[PDB]
């Protein structure tokens, strides 16, 4: 296929997960363009996802530039996935053409599902259905609760600073904070993490004390950092919070399948 010259600006796709990565059973395919896409159908038609074993899936647009593809249920462990974004020279609407093709391979690892149950204040990690860790946890206080729902594991940090001023509450104020945190596994774009919380170890398993993050012991947070990977699942249940938004960025599985497949 040849490129067509156009006075309108080209757009380049970017695919996640990373080429050659092993990811968990919750990882969606993500195709993010550096422009808004006027002809979403043309973009979807140009994206060929092949799986082994073969499984059906569907596209859903997270916003005007980024489309997600996933099956109805979590991936089968061991599945190999090929993503062919064949957008080179494709008219994506209003004179905007794909700048290039992109392709990636990724594979699905073990099924890793960690369930945080507010009724028990325990985060239980299951690997292919078997409990391997039972972690006392302290979730968000009643006034700043942890949302229920299915969270996809994202990035991880050996050390990071959590600072209330980044959302508009000064550190110096009564409810502000600036906190050095170890072993932080991100599970929502809204900023929810599983992380080390030495200051709440006595509350873990008993009382919710956090701003919404899942506090666990230093040892358990490091285990989680070492053994839980991008695309693994954290499910929160029975809190007094609401539900994680489906368009959070890592909240894809909270959209019911009929709404996901209906697309947008
Ligand atoms: C884990 O705890 C994690 C963060 N911490 C959070 C927190 O401190 O609340 C949440 S993010 C949460 C989402 N909305 C609020 C917010 O924006 N509050 C607020 C209050 C006063 C003024 C304003 C404003 O002017 O915009 C906003 C914050 C999440 C679980 C890590 C990062 O600590």
Curated annotation (Swiss-Prot):
Its main location: membrane. Is irreversibly inactivated by the beta-lactams carbapenems via the formation of a covalent adduct resulting from acylation of the catalytic Cys; imipenem is the most efficient drug for in vitro LdtMt2 inactivation. Substrate binds at residues 177, 190-191, 215. Residues 112-237 form the L,D-TPase catalytic domain. GO terms for biological process: cell wall organization; peptidoglycan-protein cross-linking; regulation of cell shape. Changing residue 177 to A/F: Decreases stability of the covalent enzyme-meropenem adduct. One of its GO terms (cellular component) is plasma membrane. Its EC number is 2.3.2.-. The keyword Transmembrane helix does not apply. Keywords: Acyltransferase, Calcium, Cell membrane, Cell shape, Cell wall biogenesis/degradation, Lipoprotein, Membrane, Metal-binding, Palmitate, Peptidoglycan synthesis, Signal, Transferase. It comes from the Bacteria. One of its GO terms (molecular function) is metal ion binding. The record marks 213 as: Binds to carbapenem drug (covalent). The peptidoglycan structure of stationary-phase M.tuberculosis is atypical since it contains a majority (80%) of 3->3 cross-links synthesized by L,D-transpeptidases that predominate over the 4->3 cross-links formed by the D,D-transpeptidase activity of classical penicillin-binding proteins. In fact, 3-3 cross-linkages predominate throughout all growth phases and the ratio of 4-3/3-3 linkages does not vary significantly under any growth condition. Consists of two tandem immunoglobulin-like Big_5 domains in the N-terminal region (residues 56-145 and 150-250), followed by a L,D-transpeptidase catalytic domain (residues 251-378) and a C-terminal tail (residues 379-408). This is L,D-transpeptidase 2. It comes from Mycobacterium tuberculosis (strain ATCC 25618 / H37Rv). The chain holds residues 142 to 405 of 408 of the full protein.
